C-alpha cells in the first residue's frame, strides 16, 4: 500500500537525464552519491531507521548501479555507456582483461532489456525491489523491508498488464532477470576486490568505503 509507480519513475528521471577499468571505477564512485539520492526518492525508504537504510544500500549498491548503466546502454551498439559520459566498447573491455564479465552484462542484461523494451518505470521498480532486500543481514525489522518489496512488485505487476496487456508474461519476465543481476553483481564485486588487492586501478573514497567491511 502507498507505493505509486509514478514516484518510482520520478526518482529515475530525477537522478539521470587508457584503462577502461579505471573509468568504470570512477563512474561507480560517482554514481554512489547519486544512488543515495535516488533511494531517498523511493517511497518509505527514508522512513526506515538509518541503520537499515545503510544495510540496504550496502547490500545492493552493486546490483543497483549495474541495472542502471545496463538499461542506459540499450542504445549502444557493442558496449556500455558510463554515467561520466564515456563509452566502454567490447574490444576495450576485452583488451583490459574484463571481457568475460563484459559479455555477461551485454548478453544477460543489456540485450534482454532492449529486446523487451524495458521502460524506465519497470527499471525503477526492479531497482526498488533490489533496494528493499529483506535478506540483507543486520536488518532490525526484516518483515518491514519484506512489506515494502511486496508493495513494489504489487504496483509493478499492476503497471504491466495495464500498459502491456498483450504481454501477460511480462511481469514475470522482468522479475526473471533478477537472478542474472545477482550473479553478475557478485562477479563484478569479485573483480573490484581483486583490483583493490593488486594495488593498481585508483579507487575513490565512496567506492572504497563500500568495499570495506563487513
Amino acid at each position: 500500500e502507498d507505493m505509486p509507480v509514478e514516484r518510482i519513475l520520478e526518482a529515475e528521471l530525477a537522478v539521470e537525464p587508457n584503462d577502461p577499468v579505471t573509468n568504470i571505477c570512477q563512474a561507480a564512485d560517482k554514481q554512489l552519491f547519486t544512488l543515495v539520492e535516488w533511494a531517498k526518492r523511493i517511497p518509505h525508504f527514508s522512513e526506515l531507521p538509518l541503520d537499515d537504510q545503510v544495510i540496504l544500500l550496502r547490500a545492493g549498491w552493486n546490483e543497483l548501479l549495474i541495472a542502471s548503466f545496463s538499461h542506459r546502454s540499450i542504445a549502444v551498439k557493442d558496449g556500455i555507456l558510463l554515467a561520466t559520459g564515456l563509452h566502454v566498447h567490447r574490444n576495450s573491455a576485452h583488451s583490459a582483461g574484463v571481457g568475460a564479465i563484459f559479455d555477461r552484462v551485454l548478453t544477460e542484461l543489456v540485450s534482454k532489456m532492449r529486446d523487451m523494451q524495458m521502460d524506465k518505470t519497470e527499471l525503477g521498480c526492479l531497482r526498488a525491489i533490489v533496494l528493499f532486500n529483506p535478506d540483507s543481514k543486520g536488518l532490525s525489522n526484516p518483515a518491514e523491508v519484506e512489506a515494502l518489496r511486496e508493495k513494489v512488485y504489487a504496483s509493478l505487476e499492476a503497471y504491466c498488464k495495464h500498459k502491456y496487456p498483450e504481454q501477460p508474461g511480462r511481469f514475470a519476465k522482468l522479475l526473471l532477470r533478477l537472478p542474472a543481476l545477482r550473479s553478475i553483481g557478485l562477479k563484478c564485486l569479485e573483480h573490484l576486490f581483486f583490483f583493490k588487492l593488486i594495488g593498481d586501478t585508483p579507487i575513490d573514497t565512496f567506492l572504497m568505503e563500500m568495499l570495506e567491511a563487513p
Binding site: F33, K40, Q53, V54, E209
Partner: peptide, 11 residues
C-alpha cells in the same frame, strides 16, 4: 563506520 554513507543519508 560507513562514514560517507551515513553523512549523505542524514543530509
Amino acid at each position: 563506520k560507513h562514514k560517507i554513507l551515513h553523512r549523505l543519508l542524514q543530509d
